[PDB]
RNA sequence: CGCGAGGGGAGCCCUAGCACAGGUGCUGCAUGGCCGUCGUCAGCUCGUGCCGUGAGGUGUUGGGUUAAGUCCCGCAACGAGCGC
């Protein structure tokens, strides 16, 4: 499906961030300062949204596995129910320095979760002395917390998808190294040369987030028939 | 072995000689092992990654908690080995 100027506005996509927390390189992308706090030119989001949906549509036509990254406390459970719909892997909880330049060292920890789900199915768990029982219990949920999106990541992703290229300019800097392409949603407080496929729009607007994912995760499934 | 007096042989015994035995002679500052001790103190480290040109750091630190590196939260870390 398609998208217009009309729809983006109501979301708060022109609604940039401050001038006091501000990245100069973000130049090209603005209108002005109606009350000191910037206004994004959406006739230059129509530019970097076309191109940055084409690139997503190709990847769902050559069936790509796209990471989802949002840790900003509003983002999270919208990263979530917008990756789940997509069939995806998502880091909603808290990124780990490694999870890309160390996928092994990390992924020795998935299997330790997948082993522990199955350990808890069987009866042999109850046999272990109940000190370990509650103890080794704790470790189950720890892993379900910070990974219930990582699990379905069995290898390294074809593109990572950020909502804040400055909070997780960590993540972005991993897929920098291991030549993955980057797909970011960025306001003004964010270096925009550190992204190949980029959306200028709101960082923290729980309705700007909301439209953009739920319109991305369409030109995923539509491009994977369904 | 022999019919036989009795010679040969193994053991052990003595005398003489030789291998050598034996030493609580030395050095714990040439060692083994075992012991004491800082100390039953919560500490000591490695892997992969991250960060510095590097020695190195990160991890193990900060805040909360614990008889404890015990654990909870945070963090460029994630776990494991010897301790608890
Ligand atoms: C006197 N100094 C030159 C000395 C010499 C030797 N060894 C030699 O000279 C042997 N060298 C050869 C190899 C034979 C040429 C030594 O072997 C020693 C010492 C130092 C002592 C000191 C001792 C001391 N108290 C118990 C008398 C002491 O307070 C301690 C301590 N740190 O608490 C010791 O270490 C001590 O007992 C000690 O070990 C010494 C020597 O071993
Ligand atoms: Mg000594
Ligand atoms: Mg002495
Ligand atoms: Mg001495
Ligand atoms: Mg103790
Ligand atoms: Mg280096
Ligand atoms: Mg930790
Ligand atoms: Mg230490
Ligand atoms: Mg520190
Ligand atoms: Mg421990």
UniProtKB/Swiss-Prot annotation:
Coiled-coil ranges (or none): 102-147
Keyword Transit peptide listed: no
Record InterPro entries: Ribosomal_uS2, Ribosomal_uS2_bac/mit/plastid, Ribosomal_uS2_CS, Ribosomal_uS2_flav_dom_sf
Keywords tagged on the record: Coiled coil, Ribonucleoprotein, Ribosomal protein, RNA-binding, rRNA-binding
Record has Hydrolase as a keyword: no
Task of the protein: Spans the head-body hinge region of the 30S subunit. Is loosely associated with the 30S subunit.
NCBIfam families in alphabetical order: rpsB_bact
Sequence similarity: Belongs to the universal ribosomal protein uS2 family.
Entry protein name: Small ribosomal subunit protein uS2
Source species: Thermus thermophilus (strain ATCC 27634 / DSM 579 / HB8)
């Amino acid at each position: 499906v398609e998208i217009t100027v009309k729809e983006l506005l109501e979301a708060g996509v022109h609604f940039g961030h401050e001038r006091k927390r501000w990245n100069p390189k973000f130049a090209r992308y603005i209108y002005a300062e109606r009350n000191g706090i910037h206004i994004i030119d959406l006739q230059k989001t129509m530019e970097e949204l076309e191109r940055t949906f084409r690139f997503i549509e190709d990847l769902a036509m050559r069936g790509g596995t796209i990471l989802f990254v949002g840790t900003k406390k509003q983002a999270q459970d919208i990263v979530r129910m917008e990756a789940e719909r997509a069939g995806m892997p998502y880091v909603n909880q808290r990124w780990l320095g490694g999870m890309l330049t160390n996928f092994k060292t990390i992924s020795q920890r998935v299997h330790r979760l997948e082993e522990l789900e199955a350990l808890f199915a069987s009866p042999e768990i109850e046999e272990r002395p109940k000190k370990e029982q509650v103890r080794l219990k704790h470790e189950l949920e720890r892993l379900q917390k910070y990974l219930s999106g990582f699990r379905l990541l069995k290898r390294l992703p074809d593109a990572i998808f950020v909502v804040d290229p400055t909070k997780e300019a960590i993540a972005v800097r991993e897929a920098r190294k291991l030549f993955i392409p980057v797909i970011a949603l960025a306001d003004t407080d964010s270096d925009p040369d550190l992204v190949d496929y980029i959306i200028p729009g709101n960082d923290d607007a729980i309705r700007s987030i909301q439209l953009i994912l739920s319109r991305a995760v369409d030109l995923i499934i539509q491009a994977r028939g369904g």
